[PDB]
Nucleic acid binder design. Sequence first.
DNA 1: TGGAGTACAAGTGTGAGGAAAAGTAGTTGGGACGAAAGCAGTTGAA
Length: 49
Amino acid sequence: IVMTASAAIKTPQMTLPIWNDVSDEQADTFCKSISKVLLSEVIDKVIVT
DNA sequence: TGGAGTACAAGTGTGAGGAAAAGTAGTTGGGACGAAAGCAGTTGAA
């Protein structure tokens, strides 16, 4: 912050307030709609013959 | 009964020897407490 005035922070974050009518089950479904999903994450095996 | 030759010693010049403790002659030994970060004008080619 004080030195270097870095536009490239190591861990840039963003805090998102959710509404007062949206629930926790609706919000956990919502976090999945944003997060990056590699194709690696859904693969159990790759068998190559 | 006088002289002709002649070895024994009194007597006279030439250099050659003797010695030592000082110095100097050739080899070998030895002398040399530093494998740091995000960042920026220049600068890579697209």
